[PDB]
Scaffold this active site. Structure first.
Site, PDB file in Angstrom:
ATOM      1  N   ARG A  65       0.797  -1.249   0.000  1.00 56.34           N
ATOM      2  CA  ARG A  65       0.000   0.000   0.000  1.00 56.34           C
ATOM      3  C   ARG A  65       0.833   1.305   0.000  1.00 56.34           C
ATOM      4  NH1 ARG A  65      -3.643  -1.106   5.014  1.00 56.34           N
ATOM      5  NH2 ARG A  65      -3.200  -3.305   4.841  1.00 56.34           N
ATOM      6  N   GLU A 102       0.824 -10.251  12.225  1.00 55.37           N
ATOM      7  CA  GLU A 102      -0.226 -11.168  12.694  1.00 55.37           C
ATOM      8  C   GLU A 102       0.386 -12.164  13.689  1.00 55.37           C
TER       9      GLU A 102
HETATM   10  O1  PRP Z   1       2.627  -1.301  11.663  1.00 56.61           O
HETATM   11  P1  PRP Z   1       2.343  -2.741  11.332  1.00 56.61           P
HETATM   12  O2  PRP Z   1       1.594  -3.491  12.421  1.00 56.61           O
HETATM   13  O3  PRP Z   1       3.540  -3.507  10.814  1.00 56.61           O
HETATM   14  O4  PRP Z   1       1.268  -2.709  10.127  1.00 56.61           O
HETATM   15  C1  PRP Z   1       1.376  -1.715   9.091  1.00 56.61           C
HETATM   16  C2  PRP Z   1       1.570  -2.373   7.741  1.00 56.61           C
HETATM   17  O5  PRP Z   1       0.506  -3.309   7.530  1.00 56.61           O
HETATM   18  C3  PRP Z   1      -0.049  -3.047   6.251  1.00 56.61           C
HETATM   19  O6  PRP Z   1       0.625  -3.903   5.319  1.00 56.61           O
HETATM   20  P2  PRP Z   1       0.270  -5.480   5.130  1.00 56.61           P
HETATM   21  O7  PRP Z   1       1.329  -6.335   5.817  1.00 56.61           O
HETATM   22  O8  PRP Z   1      -1.150  -5.655   5.624  1.00 56.61           O
HETATM   23  O9  PRP Z   1       0.411  -5.654   3.536  1.00 56.61           O
HETATM   24  P3  PRP Z   1      -0.181  -4.717   2.348  1.00 56.61           P
HETATM   25  O10 PRP Z   1       0.759  -3.529   2.242  1.00 56.61           O
HETATM   26  O11 PRP Z   1      -0.126  -5.651   1.162  1.00 56.61           O
HETATM   27  O12 PRP Z   1      -1.585  -4.368   2.788  1.00 56.61           O
HETATM   28  C4  PRP Z   1       0.190  -1.574   5.972  1.00 56.61           C
HETATM   29  O13 PRP Z   1       0.130  -1.187   4.583  1.00 56.61           O
HETATM   30  C5  PRP Z   1       1.556  -1.386   6.579  1.00 56.61           C
HETATM   31  O14 PRP Z   1       2.616  -1.697   5.644  1.00 56.61           O
HETATM   32  N1  ADE Z   2      -6.328  -1.149  11.119  1.00 51.12           N
HETATM   33  C1  ADE Z   2      -5.554  -1.282  10.030  1.00 51.12           C
HETATM   34  N2  ADE Z   2      -6.049  -0.901   8.835  1.00 51.12           N
HETATM   35  C2  ADE Z   2      -5.276  -1.043   7.750  1.00 51.12           C
HETATM   36  N3  ADE Z   2      -4.028  -1.539   7.655  1.00 51.12           N
HETATM   37  C3  ADE Z   2      -3.576  -1.912   8.843  1.00 51.12           C
HETATM   38  N4  ADE Z   2      -2.333  -2.447   9.131  1.00 51.12           N
HETATM   39  C4  ADE Z   2      -2.336  -2.652  10.477  1.00 51.12           C
HETATM   40  N5  ADE Z   2      -3.451  -2.310  11.096  1.00 51.12           N
HETATM   41  C5  ADE Z   2      -4.254  -1.824  10.061  1.00 51.12           C
HETATM   42 MG    MG Z   3       1.713  -2.656   3.930  1.00 47.25          MG
END
Ligand code: PRP
Ligand code: ADE
Ligand code: MG
Ligand code: PRP
Ligand code: ADE
Ligand code: MG
Lengths: 178, 178
Positions: A65, A102
């Site tokens: 993202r 996670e």
């Molecule tokens: O601060 P944290 O607890 O590490 O979470 C934040 C991260 O989680 C999400 O990525 P995700 O791993 O869900 O992958 P995505 O970018 O494909 O959505 C978001 O875009 C951040 O990169």
């Molecule tokens: N609440 C949330 N919404 C979207 N991305 C996330 N990554 C971690 N926590 C999130």
């Molecule tokens: Mg991410």
């Protein structure tokens, strides 16, 4: 702030995604509304120029993202954007860094030749939660001897203390939720 | 001063990644050179406005590398960008579609309210290979009763016949390699 409200109005909240008790903050409507997207990029770029002047060499965008914001922010600032990816996607020599995502482990990766020693970088992602993702990105950059000037995001979940995790690296978010 | 040469010169080609015999086309240096990235977006936007005029409603960017291009392209066209994601990432009601990816099956997904019936969309990704990813995206869009005007990429691997897989949906790439 009118420009800030353009962004705030386009965050959509989804309770209990992906797990019960949580609230997912969805940036999709920001990207879908060109005025909102433009406002988000402008606010970030403004803060960054106001805080670092001309010292930023590169923006680093975080997979996935963060990739939605990196290039546009870099472009607004007259800079290139480097990539920090989920492990296994990048060709060439790489380094990688694990972090807790996670219930198990995920890994970010950067090409060994992404930056030269001493180059100054700002990291962008959509959202700061625990700060595990951003912290892993900072570790990678530091292992290239790059200087992380700041990390930034559209959204910050303040109860998760992501800011403290990153400290002493400065952090800035457009929007804050618990 | 050829804008297209600006992009072409910033494609780095890695032999035998991920498997022997394959040449990985790495867009990273395009992103890292602000002039190259600007050129890439400008060329795409010019093609799209010359081809569809005002008919485009939204750009759809494909997770993950298509996210690097979708928002900037949309911004240049004065349009919003919608997201097509790897399955499991989007909140709320969704549609999903299988496709063959390397030796196995992957799934893309879209929020049911990303588009309304009759809205017209251009899909952007970094690279067209077999066409499976892009084809799945087209199927998803079609299921929302959106019209796919065209799909576009920076790079097209022509010996893989991706263009044929998308037909009758039109396709355009900046650069072509066997
Ligand atoms: O601060 P944290 O607890 O590490 O979470 C934040 C991260 O989680 C999400 O990525 P995700 O791993 O869900 O992958 P995505 O970018 O494909 O959505 C978001 O875009 C951040 O990169
Ligand atoms: N609440 C949330 N919404 C979207 N991305 C996330 N990554 C971690 N926590 C999130
Ligand atoms: Mg991410
Ligand atoms: O035409 P195809 O044979 O489907 O190949 C093209 C797709 O492969 C790559 O994505 P990948 O699935 O590697 O994920 P990524 O975007 O995260 O790199 C690329 O960005 C396209 O989306
Ligand atoms: N050769 C290739 N290079 C980069 N991304 C790809 N996706 C599918 N085939 C690819
Ligand atoms: Mg992809």
């Amino acid at each position: 702030d009118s420009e800030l409200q353009l962004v705030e109005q386009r965050i959509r909240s989804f309770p209990d995604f992906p797990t019960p008790g949580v609230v997912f903050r969805d940036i999709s409507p920001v990207l879908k509304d060109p005025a909102s997207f433009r406002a988000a990029i402008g606010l970030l770029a403004r803060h960054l120029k106001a805080t670092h002047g001309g010292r930023i060499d590169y923006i680093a965008g975080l997979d996935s993202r963060g990739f939605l914001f990196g290039p546009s922010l870099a472009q607004e600032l007259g800079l290139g954007c480097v990539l920090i990816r989920k492990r296994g996607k990048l060709p060439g020599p790489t380094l990688w860094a694990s972090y807790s995502l996670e219930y198990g482990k995920a890994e970010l990766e950067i090409q060994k030749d992404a930056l030269e020693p001493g180059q100054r970088v700002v990291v962008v992602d959509d959202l700061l939660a625990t700060g595990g993702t951003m912290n892993a990105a900072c570790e990678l950059l530091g292992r290239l001897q790059a200087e992380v000037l700041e990390c930034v995001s559209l959204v910050e979940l303040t109860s998760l203390k992501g800011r403290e995790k990153l400290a002493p690296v400065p952090f800035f978010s457009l929007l804050q939720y618990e």
